[PDB]
């Protein structure tokens, strides 16, 4: 069938499926909407509750972070997509406030492979914003000797990637990233990164970063997945 972010089926509660309900994935960069019409197709009780929250684009991500109901988080995320299109897609514009914040985060974090080999393309892309066009195969020939067969190093850089993406896609995306970090199920990260690459063609640095993610997920290394809370 098809997933409704306002009504999500119980079996659809996996990183793959929940990934589809991220706000940027809704492809609404425009036509921000008054909340009343957004919730016009919902129970009158839930309408009076959501109206009672007094939501706006600044605090909505925090209300999403506070709720313990994943269906409520996904719903509020849908509300965020219709209410806050510019805030949602602000990161993909090559020069933006959000893009500058993310750039500062990337320059501040040091990947393990960067610490060992600062000359590598990905390090240059994160620090000095150069070399940001490189295929996953170049990354493989270069850094496969660094990652393959090293779970500690792989998890080390993986957590950093999860922080940087944590600040790319707030709200539901951040929840999914935290879930991935908690469960060590790092391959599920594809479902986020795969949905972010074609969105990122205008931003070269972002494109190269996500390409690096694509390479690193494919490193020959065995990881054990801790239990899930959902």
């Amino acid at each position: 069938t098809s997933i409704n972010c306002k009504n999500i089926q119980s079996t659809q509660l996996t990183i793959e499926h929940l990934s589809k309900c991220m706000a940027f994935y809704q492809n609404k960069t425009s036509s921000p909407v008054v909340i009343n019409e957004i919730i016009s197709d919902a129970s009158v009780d839930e309408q009076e509750l959501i109206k009672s929250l007094n939501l706006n684009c600044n605090v909505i991500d925090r209300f999403i972070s506070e709720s313990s109901v994943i269906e409520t988080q996904v719903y509020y995320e849908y509300i965020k997509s219709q209410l806050c299109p510019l805030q949602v897609h602000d990161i993909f514009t090559i020069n933006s406030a959000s893009n500058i914040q993310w750039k500062a985060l990337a320059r501040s974090f040091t990947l393990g492979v960067c610490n060992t080999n600062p000359h590598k393309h990905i390090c240059r892309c994160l620090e000095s914003m150069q070399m940001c066009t490189s295929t996953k195969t170049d990354h493989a020939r270069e850094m496969s000797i660094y990652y393959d067969g090293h779970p500690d190093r792989f998890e080390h850089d993986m957590k950093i990637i999860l922080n940087i993406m944590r600040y790319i896609v707030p709200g539901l995306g951040r929840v999914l990233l935290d879930q991935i970090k908690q469960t060590k199920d790092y391959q599920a990260l594809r479902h986020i990164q795969g949905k972010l690459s074609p969105k990122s063609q205008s931003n070269l640095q972002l494109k190269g970063f996500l390409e690096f993610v694509d390479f690193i997920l494919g490193a020959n290394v065995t990881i054990e997945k801790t239990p899930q809370t959902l």
Partner: antibody
Amino acid sequence: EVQLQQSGPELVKPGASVKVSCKASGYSFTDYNMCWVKQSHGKSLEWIGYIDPYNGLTSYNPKFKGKATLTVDKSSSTAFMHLNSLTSEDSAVYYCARNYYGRSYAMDYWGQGTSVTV
Amino acid sequence: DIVMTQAASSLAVSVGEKVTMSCKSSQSLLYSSNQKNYLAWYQQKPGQSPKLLIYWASTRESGVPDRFTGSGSGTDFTLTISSVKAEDLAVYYCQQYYSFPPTFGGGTKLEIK
């Protein structure tokens, strides 16, 4: 403590191949990778390449990509450097040095060195 | 790739005197994300293997005397010996492990008089 012993000296006529051994003791051989350094009779020190014993994967200086080939036997904790088609330039002393990924390509414990003469 | 040049092929000092050697690099060796200079200092006594003296351009390896100090940033680095002893006479090298491949200096021979 930590020790790296290398094979005895080698005299090889030009055109043949020579293989040098590096026995590691005092640490876990697969946690640190092995670096090989060509020092001519002059003061010059040249980085040949390194090899991760756990990965088996290698990385060579573009200069020595054709001349050198690095392998390892994890059982005996030994690292081998192989030089083929020796010439006049290849006459030099070759060093085997430990490296840890956490401290980029800085070598703390060095082997005894092996003089390869052509 | 990067080329390392050292000030003196050899320098002669008397025992007890303070000595300073230079190592200059073509490209800045400072990675701003971790703020660490990728640079190292080796001591090679006559007919022996190089011993690691200093890594990261400042930190000195365990077992290296307090006399040896290293400092510098960007492209300019210097090794400084407080009171030279007889045992120190040797060839001192510097290494950059920033770019590929790691490259070395010509070496500076401390001779004792």
